[PDB]
């Protein structure tokens, strides 16, 4: 689905691309120098923020304020890797909505991190 | 040639202590990374309001993601988080499924989802990190 994720000017690291269904929301990003941490592997500074938006992003399609968010990291991503990022509206409820993102390594398949996120509507 | 599903069915029934709260709990299926279980919510499972209780829904995430852990190549808990989308009422039959997301030299991670057996509908999604102590 064609448009693109054009909230991206002024905390904003869109360097990220796409593929949009209902309650689901693929994107992709190539880890670069700016994205990374003390080591080479993008830290979850970025990852978090990435789960924040693209969740919220994937949601302004069906937008709220954050509430709770949690992230578990399980694989590094190196500078130079290209990664995909899947978002899935889990629940859309009256006052609250729930969403769950998966960040994998494209080349590898391998799961990098996985984080859930709740926001408040109204 | 492997009777992992059968076999877990006994390890479980032996070890269900606090875990003895999980007696009405069936195993439907035991893969080497996914695990399925069901459980009709009773009333000794229930909350203050008659839905399934918060704690037990975590107890079901701890234990059953740990069961899961025993299939492949146990631990201790590191962290857990759990999110609640929908009430499981009395009489309900719930499927609980577990996913080992990750392997690891000293840590293992798994995700678990509670579904309505009949709606299909989500109840709670949980994520559980253990240390391979």
From Swiss-Prot, chain B:
<feature type="modified residue" description="N6-acetyllysine">
    <location>
        <position position="24"/>
    </location>
</feature>
<keyword id="KW-0539">Nucleus</keyword>
<dbReference type="GO" id="GO:0051289">
    <property type="term" value="P:protein homotetramerization"/>
</dbReference>
<dbReference type="InterPro" id="IPR006683">
    <property type="entry name" value="Thioestr_dom"/>
</dbReference>
<feature type="modified residue" description="N6-acetyllysine">
    <location>
        <position position="121"/>
    </location>
</feature>
<feature type="binding site">
    <location>
        <position position="131"/>
    </location>
    <ligand>
        <name>CoA</name>
    </ligand>
</feature>
<dbReference type="GO" id="GO:0005634">
    <property type="term" value="C:nucleus"/>
</dbReference>
<dbReference type="GO" id="GO:0047617">
    <property type="term" value="F:fatty acyl-CoA hydrolase activity"/>
</dbReference>
<dbReference type="GO" id="GO:0005829">
    <property type="term" value="C:cytosol"/>
</dbReference>
<keyword id="KW-0496">Mitochondrion</keyword>
<comment type="similarity">
    <text>Belongs to the thioesterase PaaI family.</text>
</comment>
<feature type="binding site">
    <location>
        <begin position="84"/>
        <end position="89"/>
    </location>
    <ligand>
        <name>CoA</name>
    </ligand>
</feature>
<dbReference type="GO" id="GO:0005759">
    <property type="term" value="C:mitochondrial matrix"/>
</dbReference>
<comment type="function">
    <text>Catalyzes the hydrolysis of acyl-CoAs into free fatty acids and coenzyme A (CoASH), regulating their respective intracellular levels. Has acyl-CoA thioesterase activity towards medium (C12) and long-chain (C18) fatty acyl-CoA substrates. Can also hydrolyze 3-hydroxyphenylacetyl-CoA and 3,4-dihydroxyphenylacetyl-CoA (in vitro). May play a role in controlling adaptive thermogenesis.</text>
</comment>
<comment type="subunit">
    <text>Homotetramer. Interacts with PCTP.</text>
</comment>
<dbReference type="GO" id="GO:0005739">
    <property type="term" value="C:mitochondrion"/>
</dbReference>
<dbReference type="GO" id="GO:0005819">
    <property type="term" value="C:spindle"/>
</dbReference>
<dbReference type="GO" id="GO:0006629">
    <property type="term" value="P:lipid metabolic process"/>
</dbReference>
<keyword id="KW-0206">Cytoskeleton</keyword>
<keyword id="KW-0378">Hydrolase</keyword>
<feature type="binding site">
    <location>
        <begin position="102"/>
        <end position="107"/>
    </location>
    <ligand>
        <name>CoA</name>
    </ligand>
</feature>
<dbReference type="InterPro" id="IPR029069">
    <property type="entry name" value="HotDog_dom_sf"/>
</dbReference>
<feature type="binding site">
    <location>
        <position position="43"/>
    </location>
    <ligand>
        <name>CoA</name>
    </ligand>
</feature>
<protein>
    <recommendedName>
        <fullName>Acyl-coenzyme A thioesterase 13</fullName>
        <ecNumber>3.1.2.-</ecNumber>
        <ecNumber>3.1.2.2</ecNumber>
    </recommendedName>
</protein>
<dbReference type="Pfam" id="PF03061">
    <property type="entry name" value="4HBT"/>
</dbReference>
<feature type="modified residue" description="N-acetylmethionine">
    <location>
        <position position="1"/>
    </location>
</feature>
<keyword id="KW-0443">Lipid metabolism</keyword>
<dbReference type="GO" id="GO:0120163">
    <property type="term" value="P:negative regulation of cold-induced thermogenesis"/>
</dbReference>
<feature type="binding site">
    <location>
        <position position="75"/>
    </location>
    <ligand>
        <name>substrate</name>
    </ligand>
</feature>
<feature type="binding site">
    <location>
        <position position="47"/>
    </location>
    <ligand>
        <name>substrate</name>
    </ligand>
</feature>
<dbReference type="InterPro" id="IPR039298">
    <property type="entry name" value="ACOT13"/>
</dbReference>
<dbReference type="InterPro" id="IPR003736">
    <property type="entry name" value="PAAI_dom"/>
</dbReference>
<feature type="binding site">
    <location>
        <position position="77"/>
    </location>
    <ligand>
        <name>CoA</name>
    </ligand>
</feature>
<keyword id="KW-0963">Cytoplasm</keyword>
<feature type="modified residue" description="N6-acetyllysine">
    <location>
        <position position="34"/>
    </location>
</feature>
<feature type="modified residue" description="N6-acetyllysine">
    <location>
        <position position="40"/>
    </location>
</feature>
<keyword id="KW-0007">Acetylation</keyword>
<feature type="modified residue" description="N6-acetyllysine">
    <location>
        <position position="102"/>
    </location>
</feature>
């Amino acid at each position: 689905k064609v448009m693109f994720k054009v909230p991206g000017f002024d905390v904003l690291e869109k360097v990220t691309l796409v593929s949009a269904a209902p309650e689901k929301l693929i994107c992709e990003m190539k880890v670069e120098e700016q994205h990374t941490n003390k080591l080479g592997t993008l830290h979850g500074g970025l990852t978090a923020t990435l789960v924040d938006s693209i969740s919220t992003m994937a949601l302004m399609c069906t937008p709220g304020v954050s509430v709770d968010m949690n992230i578990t990291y399980m694989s590094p991503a190196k500078i130079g890797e290209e990664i995909v990022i899947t978002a899935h509206i889990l629940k859309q409820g009256k006052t609250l909505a729930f969403a769950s993102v998966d960040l994998t390594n494209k080349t590898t398949g391998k799961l990098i991190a996985q984080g859930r996120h709740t926001k408040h509507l109204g």
